[PDB]
Structure 1
Amino acid sequence: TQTMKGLDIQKVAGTWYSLAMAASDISLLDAQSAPARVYVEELKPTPEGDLEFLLQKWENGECAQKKIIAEKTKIPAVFKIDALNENKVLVLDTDYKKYLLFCWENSAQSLACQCLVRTPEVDDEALEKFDKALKALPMHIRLSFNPTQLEEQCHI
């Protein structure tokens, strides 16, 4: 999987909306509580060059919040979220002001990718770039949300 060249995480700070999601395996996304069914609410880069994700997930009939620190690696668009080097975040592309494409990758190989947007509206341009970035990846499920869903906890 190829990641963005020249990513500056200081420009991705702020609140985001998970507009669309895709995964390598149906069971990663299909259920409300599926493992990769996570909604990005905020990106917070640190001065050290780590990227904190504020996530929401449906768990046991409620929306739960989770913070995940993705630690910098030698690749500016590749972040590690465990000490075993099994789980990574890959930033595929961003224009900073409208959309950001990224993937969770597990090489224990499982992949779950998202199209984030800055404003809770459908962005057909961001959706086209998402589909173009996924073309070479072995996705078996895609989901997309409406503007009403983007503004509710856990996209209810």
Structure 2
Amino acid sequence: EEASSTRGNLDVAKLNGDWFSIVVASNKREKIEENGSMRVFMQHIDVLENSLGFKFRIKENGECRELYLVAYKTPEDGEYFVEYDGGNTFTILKTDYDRYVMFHLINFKNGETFQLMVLYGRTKDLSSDIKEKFAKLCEAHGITRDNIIDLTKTDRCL
């Protein structure tokens, strides 16, 4: 079941399909709150040539926008790059393919950098076990529970 990019046994092809934003976390809370550049409502991941395509809605000024971004695979094992509100590097922390997928992102913009962790799921919501499991990883990565936000409880531009 489980796989990671840092383990090399990740079959990226199975990540293709529909995904929903379940939980976001970051010690740069500003970024994941109402109007934050990172409060994304995932819709679909496309597996392309040495790249991943993301279709998602983001609410700007109270209005949902339809955005699409292409992330390119880099030479650093399991790493992907994407230009969005700065230079972003991310990796697939863990996934079971048919339920959840956990991404760990590092942003860079004007000298400063911050981390981001997201729990995208195949269903509009996931079991607490998973959300709890995610929460634990966020803390392990230095993200306090105050900066973990459950999006299933709010509007996700649906």
Q: TM-score, normalised by structure 2?
A: 0.81
Deviation at 1:3, TM superposition (A): 5.0
Give the distance between the partners of 1:11 and 1:57, measured in 2 at CA.
25
Give the distance between the partners of 1:75 and 1:93, measured in 2 at CA.
17
After TM superposition, list the pairs within 5 Å mapping 1:1-156 onto structure 2. Answer: 4-5=6-7, 6-30=9-33, 32-46=34-48, 48-82=49-83, 86-107=87-108, 108=111, 109-140=113-144, 141-146=147-152, 149=154, 153-154=156-157
After superposition, the C-alpha distances for 1:25-57 in whole angstroms (9 at most, x for unaligned) are 121112x211211111111011x2311111210
Please tell me whether the aligned partners of residues 92 and 103 of structure 2 are also in contact (alpha carbons under 8 angstroms). yes
After superposition, the C-alpha distances for 1:55-113 in whole angstroms (9 at most, x for unaligned) are 2100122100111111011245310113xx93112211101011000023114421121
Deviation at 1:153, TM superposition (A): 4.8
Please tell me whether the aligned partners of residues 52 and 72 of structure 2 are also in contact (alpha carbons under 8 angstroms). yes
Alpha carbons of 1:25 and 1:52: their partners in 2 closer, same or farther (altered >3 Å)?
same
In structure 1, the gaps of 5 or more residues are: none
Please tell me whether the aligned partners of residues 29 and 37 of structure 1 are also in contact (alpha carbons under 8 angstroms). yes
Give the distance between the partners of 1:61 and 1:92, measured in 2 at CA.
31
How many residue pairs match? The answer is 147
Q: TM-score, normalised by structure 1?
A: 0.82
Deviation at 1:133, TM superposition (A): 2.0
In structure 2, the gaps of 5 or more residues are: none
Please tell me whether the aligned partners of residues 30 and 36 of structure 2 are also in contact (alpha carbons under 8 angstroms). yes
Alpha carbons of 1:58 and 1:76: their partners in 2 closer, same or farther (altered >3 Å)?
same
Secondary structure of the corresponding residue to residue 157 of structure 2: helix
Q: Identity of aligned pairs, percent?
A: 24
